[PDB]
Amino acid sequence: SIVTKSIVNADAEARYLSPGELDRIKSFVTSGERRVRIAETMTGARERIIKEAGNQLFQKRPDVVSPGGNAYGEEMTATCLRDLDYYLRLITYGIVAGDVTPIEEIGVVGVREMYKSLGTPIEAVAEGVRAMKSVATSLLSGEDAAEAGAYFDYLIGAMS
Amino acid sequence: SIVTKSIVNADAEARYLSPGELDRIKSFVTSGERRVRIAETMTGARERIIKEAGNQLFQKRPDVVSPGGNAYGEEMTATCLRDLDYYLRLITYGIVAGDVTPIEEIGVVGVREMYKSLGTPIEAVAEGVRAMKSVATSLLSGEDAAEAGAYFDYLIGAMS
Amino acid sequence: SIVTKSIVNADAEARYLSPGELDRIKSFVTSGERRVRIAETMTGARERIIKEAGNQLFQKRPDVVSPGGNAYGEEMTATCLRDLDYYLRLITYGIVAGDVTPIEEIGVVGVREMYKSLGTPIEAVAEGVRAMKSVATSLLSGEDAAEAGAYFDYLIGAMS
Amino acid sequence: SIVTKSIVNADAEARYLSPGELDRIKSFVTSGERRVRIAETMTGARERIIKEAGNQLFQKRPDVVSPGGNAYGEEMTATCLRDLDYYLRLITYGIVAGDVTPIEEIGVVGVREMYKSLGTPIEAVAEGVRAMKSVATSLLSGEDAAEAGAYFDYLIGAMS
Amino acid sequence: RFVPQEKQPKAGDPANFLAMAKQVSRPANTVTRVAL
Amino acid sequence: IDNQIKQGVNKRREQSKVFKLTNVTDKVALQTTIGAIYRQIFERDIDPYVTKKEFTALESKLGNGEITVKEFVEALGASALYIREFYTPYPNTKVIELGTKHFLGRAPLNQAEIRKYNQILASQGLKAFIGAMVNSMEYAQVFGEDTVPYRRFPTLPAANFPNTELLYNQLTKQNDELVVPSFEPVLAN
Amino acid sequence: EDTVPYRRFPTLPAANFPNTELLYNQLTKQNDELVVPSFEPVLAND
Amino acid sequence: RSFKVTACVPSQTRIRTQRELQNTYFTKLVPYDNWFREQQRIMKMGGKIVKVELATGKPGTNTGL
Amino acid sequence: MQDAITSVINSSDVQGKYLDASAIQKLKAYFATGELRVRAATTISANAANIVKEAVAKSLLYSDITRPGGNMYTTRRYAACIRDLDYYLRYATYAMLAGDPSILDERVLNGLKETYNSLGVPIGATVQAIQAMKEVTAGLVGADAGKEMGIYFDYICSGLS
Amino acid sequence: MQDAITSVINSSDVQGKYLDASAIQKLKAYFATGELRVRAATTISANAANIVKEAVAKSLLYSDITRPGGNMYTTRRYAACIRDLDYYLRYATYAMLAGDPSILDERVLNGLKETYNSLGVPIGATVQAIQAMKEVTAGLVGADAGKEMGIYFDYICSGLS
Amino acid sequence: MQDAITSVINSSDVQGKYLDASAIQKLKAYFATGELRVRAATTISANAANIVKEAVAKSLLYSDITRPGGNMYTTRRYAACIRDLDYYLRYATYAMLAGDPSILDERVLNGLKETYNSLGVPIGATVQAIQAMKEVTAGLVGADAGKEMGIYFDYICSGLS
Amino acid sequence: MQDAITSVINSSDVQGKYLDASAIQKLKAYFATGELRVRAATTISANAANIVKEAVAKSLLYSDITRPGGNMYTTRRYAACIRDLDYYLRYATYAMLAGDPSILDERVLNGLKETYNSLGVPIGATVQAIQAMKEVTAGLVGADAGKEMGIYFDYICSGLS
Ligand SMILES: *[C@H](C)[C@H]1/C(=C/c2[nH]c(/C=C3N=C(/C=C4\NC(=O)C(CC)=C4C)C(C)=C/3CCC(=O)O)c(CCC(=O)O)c2C)NC(=O)[C@@H]1C
Ligand SMILES: *[C@H](C)[C@H]1/C(=C/c2[nH]c(/C=C3N=C(/C=C4\NC(=O)C(CC)=C4C)C(C)=C\3CCC(=O)O)c(CCC(=O)O)c2C)NC(=O)[C@@H]1C
Ligand SMILES: *[C@H](C)[C@H]1/C(=C/c2[nH]c(/C=C3N=C(/C=C4\NC(=O)C(CC)=C4C)C(C)=C\3CCC(=O)O)c(CCC(=O)O)c2C)NC(=O)[C@@H]1C
Ligand SMILES: CCC1=C(C)/C(=C/C2=NC(=C\c3[nH]c(/C=C4\NC(=O)[C@H](C)[C@H]4CC)c(C)c3CCC(=O)O)/C(CCC(=O)O)=C2C)NC1=O
Ligand SMILES: CCC1=C(C)/C(=C/C2=NC(=C\c3[nH]c(/C=C4\NC(=O)[C@H](C)[C@H]4CC)c(C)c3CCC(=O)O)/C(CCC(=O)O)=C2C)NC1=O
Ligand SMILES: CCC1=C(C)/C(=C/C2=NC(=C\c3[nH]c(/C=C4\NC(=O)[C@H](C)[C@H]4CC)c(C)c3CCC(=O)O)/C(CCC(=O)O)=C2C)NC1=O
Ligand SMILES: CCC1=C(C)/C(=C/C2=NC(=C\c3[nH]c(/C=C4\NC(=O)[C@H](C)[C@H]4CC)c(C)c3CCC(=O)O)/C(CCC(=O)O)=C2C)NC1=O
Ligand SMILES: CCC1=C(C)/C(=C/C2=NC(=C\c3[nH]c(/C=C4\NC(=O)[C@H](C)[C@H]4CC)c(C)c3CCC(=O)O)/C(CCC(=O)O)=C2C)NC1=O
Ligand SMILES: CCC1=C(C)/C(=C/C2=NC(=C\c3[nH]c(/C=C4\NC(=O)[C@H](C)[C@H]4CC)c(C)c3CCC(=O)O)/C(CCC(=O)O)=C2C)NC1=O
DSSP: OHHHHHHHHHHHTTSOOOHHHHHHHHHHHHTHHHHHHHHHHTTTTTTHHHHHHHHHHHHHOTTSSSTTSSSOSTTTHHHHHHHHHHHHHHHHHHHHHOSSTTHHHHHTSSOHHHHHHHTOOHHHHHHHHHHHHHHHHHHTTSHHHHHHHHHHHHHHHTTO | OHHHHHHHHHHHHTSOOOHHHHHHHHHHHHTHHHHHHHHHHHHHSOHHHHHHHHHHHHTTOTTSSSTTSSSOSSSSSSHHHHHHHHHHHHHHHHHHHTSSHHHIIIIITTHHHHHHHHOOOHHHHHHHHHHHHHHHHHHSOHHHHHHHHHHHHHHHHHHO | OHHHHHHHTTTTTTOOOOHHHHHHHHHHHHSOHHHHHHHHHHHHTHHHHHTTHHHHHHHHOOTTTSTTSSOOHHHHHHHHHHHHTTHHHHHHHHHTTTSSHHHIIIIITTSHHHHHTTTOOTTHHHHHHHHHHHHHHHSSOTTHHHHTTTTTHHHHHTTO | OOHHHHHHHHHHTTSOOOHHHHHHHHTTTTSHHHHHHHHHHHHHSHHHHHHHHHHHHHHHSOOTTSTTSSSOSHHHHHHHHHHHHHHHHHHHHHHHHSSSTTHIIIIITTHHHHHHHHTOOHHHHHHHHHHHHHHHHHTSOTTHHHHHHHHHHHHHHHHO | OOOOOOOOSSOOOOOOOOOOOOOOOOTTOOSSOSOO | OTTTTOSTTTTTSSSSOOOBOOOTTOSHHHHHHHHHHHHHHTOSOSGGGOSSOOTHHHHHHHHHTSSOHHHHHHHHHTSHHHHHHHTTTSOTTTTHHHHHHHSSSSOOOSHHHHHHHHHHHHHSOHHHHHHHHHTSHHHHTTTOSSBOOOOOOOOSSTTTTTTTTTTSSSOTTSOSSOSOOSOOOOSOO | OOSOOOOOOOOSSTTTTTTTTTTSSSOTTSOSSOSOOSOOOOSSOO | OEEEEEEEOOOSSOOOSSOOSTTTEEEEEEETTTHHHHHHHHHHTTOEEEEOOBSSOOTTOOSOO | OOOHHHHHHHHHHHTTOOOOHHHHHHHHHHHTTHHHHHHHHHHHHHTSTTTHHHHHHHHTSSSTTTSBTBSTTSHHHHHHHHHHHHHHHHHHHHHHHHTOSHHIIIIITTSHHHHHHHHTOOSHHHHHHHHHHHHHHHHHHOTTTHHHHHHHHHHHHHHHO | OOOSHHHHHHHHHHTTOOOOHHHHHHHHHHHHTHHHHHHHHHHHHHTHHHHHHHHHHHHTSSSSTTSTTSTTOSTTHHHHHHHHHHHHHHHHHHHHHHTSTTHHHHHTSSSHHHHHHHHTOOHHHHHHHHHHHHHHTHHHHHHHHHHHHHHHHHHHHHHHO | OOOSHHHHHHHHHHSOSOOOHHHHHHHHHHHHHHHHHHHHHHHHHHSHHHHHHHHHHHHSSSSTTTSSSSSSSSHHHHHHHTHHHHHHHHHHHHHHTTSOTTHHHHHTTTSTTTHHHHTTOOHHHHHHHHHHHHHHHHHHHOHHHHHHHHHHHHHHHHHHO | OOOTTHHHHHHHHHTSOOOOHHHHHHHHHHHHTHHHHHHHHHHHHHSHHHHHHHHHHHHTSSSSSSSBTBTTOSHHHHHHHHHHHHHHHHHHHHHHHHTOTHHHHHHTSSSHHHHHHHHTOOHHHHHHHHHHHHHHHHHHHOHHHHHHHHHHHHHHHHHHO
């Protein structure tokens, strides 16, 4: 994580890592006990978030809800509802990791060539996780939502 | 500073700043009032490190002030104190920047050519920063000198 | 005066008098009796200024009074006093008209090549006005001594 | 030289060099080494001409070394040996050149507003070359003082 | 020690420095009387 | 001298030597090639710009033979010393005329070769930009995988020649301005 | 003293000709930059 | 992650006075993302590869690169 | 490139001094604004393709240049104008996090007066673009947060002119 | 880039129109010269090495330039000058087969004036050689293709001088 | 290459499902030990030349391997032999800060089985050189942190011979 | 790049003549003094870190220029100036063994005046270091070679000033 993001940065310049990094890694571990609190809030909400936001993108975009869209059918509306379960379960690894190196390689790298092969609109899932972001700030206590909500904001700004 | 390392790390990606890098400024600026409440005493107590740096060097390295050594007699105990007075500032300059990269571009990155040529041993100036390390940690509190002591220790590893 | 100064640019572009020029003509008719008043202060302090400000010129510049310069004895210093009592009158003639052009068309336009063709250093006349500066501000209230002090101000910068 | 002067007359007339002007060039190079023989009397005794003029400068104009003048003290009086040797080196350039075109390029065209901004008197320079005229021609032969005295008179003419 | 020790292309005064008296003028000198 | 040195091939194109790497188990022949990589990629000495010898890990992988010089030119220019020296204080159209100076040893070829790398440099960083140059075909037959890049003197594209001696007669950091902004379109569309 | 000034075409000074058609082929307010900054000194000191 | 490739390739267009054994036979370490391009470059000269087992190891992993 | 907090550093070190009291106060003006700057940094990064998405529609689209005859009509040239306007937004984000125009004149202002004249692309439409980018970035970060954003935009469009 | 068929295409493209009646007969004017440009380009390509070796003997030999000090003195430079002239022939047969002289500004006359001024090549001896080359290749293609070949040398010949 | 942090993340996706409370306790066991293993990194980054100096001076500075014959006779075969030692010490800091011995498998221990054999290099000197190097770090970082780095340091011994 | 062998053998080439008796006295002058040059060449390289050391102690060090505000205060560049002063030392020896200042035009004075004013380094302080280096060399090698090596030192001071 923030170890391995920094360790590969220290190895690329071939040296012992900075004391600027030493205040980074010390603050991560001493704030990790509330960082695991954010992950267990998503355990009991794992049906509550995805039930509202998939319908919220269906009313933000009713392009999809008609025959001729991409989620249209009981295996096809279950396609995007399950992929929204994946992206929630993706970045909850990255809350307690504290940076983007778990989310980016197994979520973000091959996307644009995949979704054009899958026929899905990239702008749909871009505003779909925007619907996932807004309810995540409500159940948490503001500031800890604000440090974990930026990984949502990483995921919005890296599709398109 | 801590921003400037992340800026060229952003442009080598040529992307935006990832939120693994954003919070490391959020830990920096809210402790920025804390960090300026560290080094200003080291600007304040100026002489007290310096006169306790030379005499704490000369008992651990007495062959420097012998005849034949570079530093010898008068006017060559003061410029070795004044070249040591230079490297006192950059410890404070690394603290208020929150990173060791302004120490490099004015004070580290060309030491192995100019101290090769001048004949001053780079190990012997490294022990002087190790001599002035103990007198600066006493002037600060113990959890405050623990981060500032590593700022010495990078220059230790850069000299040695 | 100001009525000629407001028209000589205006008639050169062949137009009536601008609204932003008549107000200075208007406010001079409100505030020109102070210029009547401070002219009468300079008449009563006519010889009173240069009994020590001329001495203040010889205090800071004893170059000219020595054998070798220009001023020798009583007479030659008296003609310097006559030239400097030609000079306090000219600014007193200039404050009652309220411009630089009463000062300009008598003494300032030919100030340079006369004095280079006389042996008089043109820098040395400026300290006598600089000694006339500190007494004329001090003999007046500081409200009126600003703007009448501002009328020596062009007369300083056109010597050197 | 005449060659960089008679060309500039002939280029402005857009003609060839007229053979009346060629005999000025033809009589130049045969009388050239006699003009060179003037110059080693100048640059040989060039430490003696500056000493014989400068005290004679400060007997004719003894007032620049007065306190509160322009050049009093050890450092400012020592400029005037360099400020006269600058003209002494320029004059012996011209007798070698045969004409005035080194002097008017180097020392003449901005002599006023440099010295007027410095506050130095012009006529003290004008007697300083005039002190240097009679000293150098007394070291010079009877025909040679007539020709080389005229180049001194241009530098008096430069200030006039 | 320190001692930079360079060269130069100016100076070398042979000191002279004669000096003088400096007397003040009484504030009454006839401003008016100069000539004809 | 006007007919001597001033004939049009400025005689250092065909008397400057190149460096091969046939001798990977030789050690002193390796050391003057590694300096030749340093004096062509960064093209100064790298001695006053490094806190400590920095690349001596992957310098030591060379000579052991499990990397090549095409490895060693690519990963060195990808490192953070090339970012600090040649990527930060210059525009990303200067970098295209600076990356082609050291790697591949020429000017940019066409207007489209500016468009090719600026397509790359906006999407990915210098990471995939430096992978796009040395793994191209034009690196492969004129340099090869055993040679250092060197300054070479093209003849076939029109603006390829005089933009090299407006790139190489300058020294390093001589001008902040880029020498060729782009290539001129000759007509409407 | 009876003629209007007009655009004239010099020949005798060297840089006088091509700095006129770098002054007249431009229209008015065509460039904010001055066309010739100054003239080049050719050697060390003159 | 990286591979340990070895391959053989001749050049067709020219006859070279230098030796080129290291140019006609490789044993290179190449990383994972250059290998999508580095393998294709030997196809254009038509050279054969032989042993392409990875040296960095850990296949089939998801994260950790 | 250098930080605003390192602008305090090198200017006090060309004079050879230490951190003095007003030079502490130069950092203290930074440390009251930095926590808003990083809160502004998230919304511009998440909407990096959702600021230019509205901006080109707000000023550039359905005009002469998107029609044939103009410049933006061919898809190669439209692919650069989406690229260059994303490019200025990323470097203005670097201007806001550093608090400096020092990154802009190094990179995006050295050749920009010359690369745009050589390609024939109009400078004045870019002046309309980033001023419209200045308006559309304030609508989603806030006029309190867009004001510190709205300094270096005027540093950009001055350098175009 | 710019062809002759593309020239009437790109003029029709920036208007946004289609193939109009005047745009078709100009496009059919290129096809009416279609047998001339193909047959002449086969003739020059078969006689490339003989039309060069007459053109250097017609103008360049037995002068100052083939003597010591001249720019085609040595065996590097006289072998270079044949190749540097042969690109003027081969690209002129590109411009005939294109039917438009804008292939010369893209790939011949771009930095060519900047090279030869920096190299000490006599431009007026080059433009004398191409002008001698234009006459001798008009006798090999006939008077019909000799006008169309004779244009495209003097688009090169005015780009040099 | 992965740490102990993304060890449990990589096992979470091979099993596919979200990580449960036993996997949570494996992750937060790092956090009880995270603040002390960074305290080892403070003092090991300072004196990194000191650890590799006296470990030579323990048993490798007056030795038969340093006298004619051997493998540290010349200064160049010296210049790798000390260069391997801080490379083990740097990557031991890389191992002990991440909890995983998998970092130095592919970066250090990839070719060390056969490159020390093919070059005629004694491993039995370097295995002797590191067990004295292991004991001096635990005195310098403290016994609370020196134990846990040793099992990443004795991990190097299992891959060496 | 040329040589006193080659510059008198190429200038006689470009005139078209052969080895003239006036041209034969320059080669035999170079063949007479060539044994003096090659013993003078080795003594520079044996003292190359000490000619540069005594130059900066006699001209550069302990002044305002190494005091903050001067250009030498950054130790990035005091490493670079010893690198810069090494360049004039080795290229003077290359001008000495060639007997020719022609390498200094093409490899030192190509664009050297523009790149020093682009950084704002002092011109005369470097010229004062060349005046330091010419007397240190003439003492260490003997005055018969220092009176020839210093000629190419004055060729550097002519181009730098
Ligand atoms: C040092 C005696 C003076 C000085 C120097 C200063 N120099 C810097 C140096 C540069 N020097 C060069 C020069 C050459 N490169 C070459 O290849 C050759 C011929 C073989 C020469 C003569 C160049 C190209 C640079 C700048 C490029 C770079 O940054 O590497 C700097 C460095 C620029 C910077 O911003 O760091 C400084 C101060 N100042 C003094 O005090 C001495 C007078
Ligand atoms: C020959 C009749 C005349 C002449 C020629 C000459 N040219 C050179 C050098 C060059 N010529 C070129 C030309 C081109 N490059 C292009 O891309 C194109 C468009 C396709 C052209 C026409 C270039 C780049 C050079 C310089 C380097 C090179 O040769 O590749 C030389 C000699 C210089 C050398 O180093 O070989 C000569 C002699 N000179 C004459 O005297 C004739 C009048
Ligand atoms: C878009 C809003 C405006 C516009 C843009 C336009 N730009 C180009 C081409 C280039 N622009 C640049 C400049 C830079 N590229 C960079 O990467 C950087 C620094 C990070 C700068 C300063 C360059 C180099 C090009 C050329 C190729 C490239 O894109 O890199 C074009 C294409 C012009 C052409 O004919 O190819 C266009 C159309 N044009 C508009 O209409 C808008 C006002
Ligand atoms: C995290 C990385 C990841 C992705 C992307 C992923 C995609 C994925 N999408 C699938 C189906 C699908 N998913 C979609 C998705 C969509 N259509 C819509 O209506 C929406 C607009 C849009 C998503 C929001 C579609 C259309 C299919 C069926 C395939 C097809 O016929 O096109 C299936 C097949 C069913 C199965 O799982 O057995 C997989 C594996 N799995 C992954 O692990
Ligand atoms: C901020 C970055 C920076 C660094 C690193 C720096 C080093 C530096 N040390 C110098 C001198 C010196 N430095 C020493 C130092 C020492 N002698 C010894 O024996 C001891 C080992 C050692 C220090 C304890 C001595 C003796 C000199 C004078 C050299 C001489 O007189 O020969 C000088 C030349 C004179 C000066 O300007 O001070 C520089 C430039 N200057 C800088 O601006
Ligand atoms: C206000 C308008 C005005 C000015 C400027 C002016 C200057 C002036 N100064 C004169 C003389 C003089 N003026 C001075 C005055 C000085 N010489 C110095 O070196 C001192 C700096 C300065 C003393 C303050 C002297 C010494 C002479 C006589 C010069 C001589 O006879 O050699 C004369 C000739 C005699 C006369 O008519 O007074 C004029 C016209 N007269 C005017 O009506
Ligand atoms: C060859 C062309 C040439 C000219 C004209 C020239 C003028 C010149 N005169 C100067 C100074 C000076 N010149 C003088 C003049 C004098 N001292 C006196 O007391 C008398 C009034 C007078 C002549 C004897 C004085 C006093 C200074 C120093 C000014 C100061 O430092 O305040 C200076 C500044 C320092 C210096 O270089 O000396 C210049 C450049 N330099 C040149 O290279
Ligand atoms: C020629 C290639 C070569 C070198 C460089 C070399 C160095 C070398 N120096 C050693 C020790 C040493 N060598 C020195 C040498 C010196 N310190 C001083 O005081 C003097 C200035 C200087 C030499 C005169 C010292 C002090 C030690 C002992 C270090 C210690 O005990 O910590 C050792 C371990 C002892 C041994 O030889 O077995 C080696 C291998 N051996 C070689 O074969
Ligand atoms: C971190 C990544 C990395 C690794 C793993 C690495 C290993 C490595 N060790 C090597 C050599 C060496 N390794 C040693 C090792 C030792 N000296 C002894 O006597 C003991 C047996 C042992 C330690 C005390 C020696 C003597 C050589 C030189 C062999 C030679 O060059 O002949 C070489 C051959 C090239 C060279 O000379 O450096 C490699 C590649 N290099 C790397 O960059």
